[PDB]
Amino acid sequence: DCDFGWSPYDQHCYQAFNEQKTWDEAEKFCRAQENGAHLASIESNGEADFVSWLISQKDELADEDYVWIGLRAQNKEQQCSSEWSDGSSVSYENLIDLHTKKCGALEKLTGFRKWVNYYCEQMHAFVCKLLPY
């Protein structure tokens, strides 16, 4: 039972929002939609194709580089390389003034299919996925 603005696919409902939000703002927004949605997960080929068609069809969208989906690293360090190339492990880190690429996005130049890790605090358009009631 999808609402106007949402597109059905495979028992879920999807909507690409042209508001530009941080990855956290986008997820929170999605949760506040209908009976509570999330940034889209992509769980298959078919769905990747669907989400990709959904975006490429949203006209406000735009010319837009990146589109958030629900991918986030968890993490737990602030970079994910556990060892230096000499086999030693990383204890001291100097990540002051460096932003992390721990949120996943779809990208215009790769047809909104391939996943790109990118900076979470960057504002972009996004896709919500919902299981209707």
Binding site: E27, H38, L39, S41, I42, E43, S44, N45, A48, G70, L71, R72, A73, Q74, N75, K76, Q79, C80, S81, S82, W84, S85, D86, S88, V90, S91, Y92, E93, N94, L95, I96, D97, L98, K101, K102, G104, E107, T110, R113, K114, W115, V116, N117, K129
Partner: protein, 123 residues
């Protein structure tokens, strides 16, 4: 001490190389040293302060490779809706870490960009 042209700090030998290579070519070059060696690793602030002292005279202020590659790879990626991350579809992209020849601050770069680098081995 350390072979000529190299510098010791705390049981290890270091050399700067002002020669733009991509991360792999730079780590390659280190491995090719007569004593087999790697891109510098940092275990402390004081070791970083010593290495920038080395980089400064000739390399500063180029980006310099340190030995951390694929820094966004083995993160614990998940879906915000809790679905299993089973299906996957990532680019085709790798990041590596560098610092300027003048400060201790790290910088995430495309692994196929071209920087200077420092080699390091145990004495």
């Amino acid at each position: 001490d350390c072979p000529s042209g190299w510098s010791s700090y705390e049981g290890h030998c270091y050399k700067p190389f002002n020669e733009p290579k991509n991360w792999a070519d730079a780590e390659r070059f280190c491995k090719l040293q007569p004593k087999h060696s790697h891109l510098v690793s940092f275990q402390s602030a004081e070791e970083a302060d010593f290495v920038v002292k080395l980089t400064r005279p000739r390399l500063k202020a180029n980006l310099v490779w340190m030995g951390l590659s694929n820094i966004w790879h083995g993160c614990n990626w998940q879906w915000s809706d809790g679905a299993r991350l089973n299906y996957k579809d990532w680019q085709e992209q790798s990041e590596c870490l560098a610092f300027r020849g003048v400060h201790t601050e790290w910088l995430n770069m495309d692994c196929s960009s071209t920087c200077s680098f420092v080699c390091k081995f145990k004495a």
